[PDB]
């Protein structure tokens, strides 16, 4: 006969990334279109990450939830080759989540929501005060660092600088060495692209899950149990998070 508040963490996007093949290979005039295909895959991932935010966002006191100490706590606790700025800025998504929180917050809503105790709710809110956000941020940071390290690697050539090889080796051998360097760099870029594809798929799954929650778990009632919340469902309280979404599911249990 008691209510509780459960915190759910769902990543919806990671750091934006893209490459410029005209500058990536050299700061062979044009090795091939393989790098162009890699850049196309990366910009497809970028568009997917820009769309995930629109999929999830913009789709008895409440001082802690309604502004936003929780949002600030998540902001400060959670921390070619150009990182593009996200299309939706932090304050865009903050305004969107605040507006949707205001929409879903409007003690008569408790009376109407019982069809499908202030101290218990206050205690559940207080006991709350981010692992997957750190996971994805650190993982993409390590991915970019590893890609830079592979860029610095000679990959069996005689140096890591194309201009140094041009000024140091004859053309009939400089072309072979540059071919080795560019093939190794494009192999590293292929590893980055495929890792970003699989991780983009895994973040798209979570973004679709979060969008479903933001459509039914926060709007109206989640008639389906165990989806969001430990038991029967009353309402959810979304919270903007850096490269993620935080839900505060208010559940009712016997």
């Amino acid at each position, epitope marked *: 006969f008691t209510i509780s508040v459960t915190t759910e963490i769902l990543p919806v996007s990671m750091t934006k990334t893209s490459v410029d093949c005209t500058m990536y290979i050299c700061g062979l005039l044009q090795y091939g279109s393989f790098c162009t295909q890699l850049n196309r895959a990366l910009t497809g991932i970028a568009v997917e990450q820009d769309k995930n935010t629109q999929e999830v966002f913009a789709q008895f006191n409440f001082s802690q939830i309604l502004p936003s100490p929780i949002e600030d706590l998540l902001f400060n606790k959670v921390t070619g080759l150009t990182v593009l700025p996200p299309l939706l800025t932090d304050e865009m998504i903050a305004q969107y989540t605040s507006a949707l929180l205001a929409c879903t917050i409007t003690p008569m809503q408790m009376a109407y929501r019982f069809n499908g105790i202030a101290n218990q709710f206050n205690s559940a809110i207080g006991k709350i005060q981010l692992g997957k956000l750190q996971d994805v941020v650190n993982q993409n940071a390590q991915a970019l660092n590893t890609l830079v390290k592979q860029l610095s690697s*000679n*990959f*069996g050539a005689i140096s890591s600088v194309l201009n140094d090889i041009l000024s140091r*080796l004859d053309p009939p051998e400089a072309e072979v060495q540059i071919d080795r360097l560019i093939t190794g760099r*494009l*192999q590293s870029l*292929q*590893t980055y692209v495929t890792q970003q594809l699989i991780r983009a798929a895994e973040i798209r799954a979570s973004a679709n899950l979060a969008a479903t929650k933001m459509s039914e778990c926060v709007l109206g009632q989640s008639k389906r149990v165990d989806f969001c919340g430990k038991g029967y469902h009353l309402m959810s309280f979304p919270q903007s998070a850096p490269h993620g979404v935080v839900f505060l599911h208010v559940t009712y249990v016997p």
Partner: antibody
Amino acid sequence: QVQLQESGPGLVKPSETLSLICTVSGGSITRDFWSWVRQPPGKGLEWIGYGYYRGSTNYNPSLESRVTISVDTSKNQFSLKLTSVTAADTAVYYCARETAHNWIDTWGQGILVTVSS
Amino acid sequence: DIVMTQSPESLALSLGERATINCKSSQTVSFTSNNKNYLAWYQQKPRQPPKLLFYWASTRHSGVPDRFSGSGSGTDFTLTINSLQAEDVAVYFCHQYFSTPWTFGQGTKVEI
């Protein structure tokens, strides 16, 4: 037809520079990279590093701070100077002509060098 | 640093039969984009300089008879001496030229 012949002292004193000069007969010396592969007795071949007539050079990482190689086009030769020769450097040396993709084409009749007395 | 291993060692094969030598690499020795194996096979005769038998682990050099056939995929590499004769007695080894340092094989001596 490219032939490589080694020359140098068969006995080198410990902690003294080991100089081995490989002379190339036939073909040309300003054509490919030149390595100085080494085989210790009863051990697999060890790649010491490949030079170049332009002055370009790439040592083995394990021996980068002690190996030095110099290619002279005027005399059509290339020489290996191994410094700080310890007791474990006793081995046979093959001067090789590594091609553009850096696989050995001609190996050359290596010379055995040992440290004693 | 790539560790290159010759699992078959001291192959005592008679005349008219086949000897197989396997070279195993610690990691891949071929670029994923090109799928071109950066491995070579050499043979060394006693009191004689070694000779280049195979480069790219598939392509054959000049003067190599049809007896020797090389292949492989990624890490495993196979050299088969079809119809081995007395001329094939030597120490065969594998070389990688993918990334420095360029470690050779331990050397497998094929005895009659």
